[PDB]
Amino acid sequence: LTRSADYLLDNVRIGNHRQRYDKYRRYVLLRSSEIFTSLVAIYAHIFSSYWQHFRRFTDQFQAPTGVQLPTFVARVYISTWLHDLYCSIREATRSISPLAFNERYSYELLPYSTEYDPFLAFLSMSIKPTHIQHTPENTLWIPILCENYDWDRNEANHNPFGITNFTLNSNLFYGLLAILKERKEFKLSTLTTNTIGRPCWLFDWHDNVQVCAWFPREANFNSQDVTAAYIIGVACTPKLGPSDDDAWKYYASLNSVPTFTPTEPRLTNRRSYGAYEVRTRETENNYFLPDSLLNIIEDFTVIRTKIRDWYYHSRVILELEDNSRTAALRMFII
Amino acid sequence: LTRSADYLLDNVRIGNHRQRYDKYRRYVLLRSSEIFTSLVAIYAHIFSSYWQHFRRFTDQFQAPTGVQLPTFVARVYISTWLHDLYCSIREATRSISPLAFNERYSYELLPYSTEYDPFLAFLSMSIKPTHIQHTPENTLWIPILCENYDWDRNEANHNPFGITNFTLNSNLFYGLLAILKERKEFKLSTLTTNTIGRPCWLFDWHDNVQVCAWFPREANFNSQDVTAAYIIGVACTPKLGPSDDDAWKYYASLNSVPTFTPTEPRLTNRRSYGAYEVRTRETENNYFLPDSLLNIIEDFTVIRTKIRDWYYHSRVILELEDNSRTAALRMFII
Amino acid sequence: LTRSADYLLDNVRIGNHRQRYDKYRRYVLLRSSEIFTSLVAIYAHIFSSYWQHFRRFTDQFQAPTGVQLPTFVARVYISTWLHDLYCSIREATRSISPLAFNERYSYELLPYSTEYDPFLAFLSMSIKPTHIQHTPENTLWIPILCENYDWDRNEANHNPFGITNFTLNSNLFYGLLAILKERKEFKLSTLTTNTIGRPCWLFDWHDNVQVCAWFPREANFNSQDVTAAYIIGVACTPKLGPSDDDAWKYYASLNSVPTFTPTEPRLTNRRSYGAYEVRTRETENNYFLPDSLLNIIEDFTVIRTKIRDWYYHSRVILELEDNSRTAALRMFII
Amino acid sequence: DWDRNEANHNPFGITNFTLNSNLFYGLLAILKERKEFKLSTLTTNTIGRPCWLFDWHDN
Amino acid sequence: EATRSISPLAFNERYSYELLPYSTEYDPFLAFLSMSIKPTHIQHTPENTLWIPILCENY
């Protein structure tokens, strides 16, 4: 049947057409406030179990209000790492997708370090513009640290993102790096200069520990990424996976039944399925009606439309007509 | 710049798309009445210069009213050749374009001869479904002998086309073939079994000897086809070439100026040109008006639209957007 | 059938006749201001991607208005390239078609630069007296930047063509050329001194993305010209392809039905076809009747004529007489 | 008396002077393809010959 | 002709009018100033300059 397929490919009848190019850019806004908190919390623990090695250097600095010195040192460390992560993503988007550079990462920062611990170096390597394959849309997800930044040059006042306890301190940072360098307990890693990251930061986090992948495991991730997502015990992005929405139910007041994972009945039927599924419910407290529906009630002293957007991986048949069908059949059965 | 082109071809941005397949079928109605007359006239001349060899065999038959015996013999010869040409085209369209077989050539005839003179054999080889390349539409022209046929089995009454002096005669034909076979003056040729013809029959014939090709000479014809069209001193098909139509001019009565090949002025400008051009004029004697225009005159006691159909060889750019432009430029200048 | 062909060719009976010579010169006016804006917009982004090398160089200049500085740099760059493109077309017309040199390109200018980025050095090579083969007219198209050229010697106010934001700045241009030369990310190629261009600037740009080639792909273009047409994301010339239009429809009030892709009922049947077709519809909402129907209705309170210009690739038969037909048949079948 | 529109172009004062690029280039193609007509390229020399300087007298 | 290969802008603004020279031979000194009075280049001054000699403003 390959002769018939070549006939249908020379005359351009069948194909592999797509409306969207291969590494289609998508901005996704990072948390950077939950990540910061959890990273500070998990690094203060590693700092306090080795505090004899940092106690004499950090006696010159003072923690702001009631912060313990390990927590303050971890805050400075993580704030500097985030500062440099901005620059990592900026220099990664300059090369690939130069338009996201121009419209999201035009402002230039200089990085404070080229050397962090192995895990922060891994996260620097991973939170670049990740490439996701075999989903309906071949995509390049680009992390956005903030929609607006509020730059300024004062180092002790710089808070380029909306993080509460973001603290930059050069003396502390470089003394701390020197300590980590000379202590044989602690490892350090040079930040790589790759341009495509890993999907460690892209999983969907639900109410339980129900963290789930909306992309295939083959060609995307390899469970070192699941480990990197595990160490950051919070969601890194909003929920990006598909869902099979039901129809809205209406109630007069707050008299709705509780949500049943025992599967209270959904109005419509099911259309799309996954190997793993999470069922949620979205309540809306103050919804009056569509204003056209209000007009209808007033005229009462019904027609209903809905736009469906089907999305696919490609378009396989481009031009169909019975002459080509008959030819491609004849060249197979005669 | 080939890297940028491969980038624009993997992401399907540029291409070679066409809405019509490669050997697109087109029925064109043959004359078959002018061809018959001119072929009879040019074969009666070759028969009368060798009449000593046909005089004793043809004394048993009688020409109908006032026809000379060479003309009658040529009529029988050409009528049988046309009968067999029907079958040639039918068996050619069976294989390629089996749908034109089903809808134009379903009726089965049996051919009388597999052997004609070299020129009628050449014409049998040439008036099959010709393939024309490098015109805007890659086409397969299929000759139609008649729109309706009026079959019947009586051999002496069979006139499967609308030809006046179409005469079938088996005894005459086979004696004549035997004579042509044993006379060393006359050659005979076995009809080939090809399926694609030659464009000998497809040229456009104008008022003068202005016979002109609406297709390139390279890959189409080679001046043996011009010779075969020359020997048939009439048009084989209607005029199939393109023309740059002007706007209509209006006159009250027949007071129009004569047509000037000295180029009386045309209303609109020119859009399309050829290396050869023939200018004609189309008079229409009884044209009242569009009925909407008559309604407008009555309402008088203006808006004008026109559908333009642009036709091309292919579609070269399929999906354009500035991200791909910038990428394909960056990968050439950086 | 070659002896008869040779005999008909020794006499001027048949041949390959055309009314236009081989590279028939046709002037075609470039857009020159849509191209300008498209190129400025595509190059401002490239410059902004590496703006850390132009932010100090451009501190000496001031942008005319709210136009950003990368757009200013790109505008000066593209204006200089257009200025030099005039000169490159001028030197190409000197070796090919000296008549175009005498009528359209007599004014002498030396180019600002002989080095440009690989893309503008590619369009410099392409936008030239290009040659199109295997279309009805064998044409050499000559690009025209402007009809009247409005020259000037003071290069601050110099705007030869009628481009809006055209700006010549030798200080800016030569500083920018030094920057592009010393930088390792920017590459510069010298302009090639060829005479014949490429069809990268002649495709027809239609409604949505429908860019379509009105000429064969064989011997004309090779998908690198489609890439150059792609990076210039606009039309370079007006519509030059064939069109099969029908009669005019008339309307009293603006009740004109919108041009439906459902294929609004065309009046006349189609004559010429292509592999790819685009259907449009032009309007004239105040058209006055052509002074003849006005006469007719005035003496009321019609004869129609039309000039057709049938264009062809060649004329194949030059002189048709019965004696040569019979001689060509006789040397074939005897 | 120069001119750029080569239809009305008559630089010198010749009476029946006519420039036609269509005619000229078609005729050049004819003379080139025909085997009886020969065409030579113009030589780029500087000094000419006296073929145009003799004195033409009565008979 | 020197401004044509170096700084075509000086050719466009100041040296567009075409003249052919009377001579290509002069005594060794005027053939030296011919070689010298040209678009000269000066280095290691605050401005790296190409000076273009102008015989007259309006010609």
TrEMBL record, chains A, B, C:
Keywords: Capsid protein, Membrane, Transmembrane, Transmembrane helix, Virion. GO terms for cellular component: viral capsid. The chain crosses the membrane at residues 28-51. This is Coat protein.
Automatic annotation (TrEMBL), chain D:
It comes from the Viruses. This is Coat protein. It comes from Pepper cryptic virus 1. The lineage of its organism: Viruses, Riboviria, Orthornavirae, Pisuviricota, Duplopiviricetes. The chain holds residues 178 to 236 of 412 of the full protein.
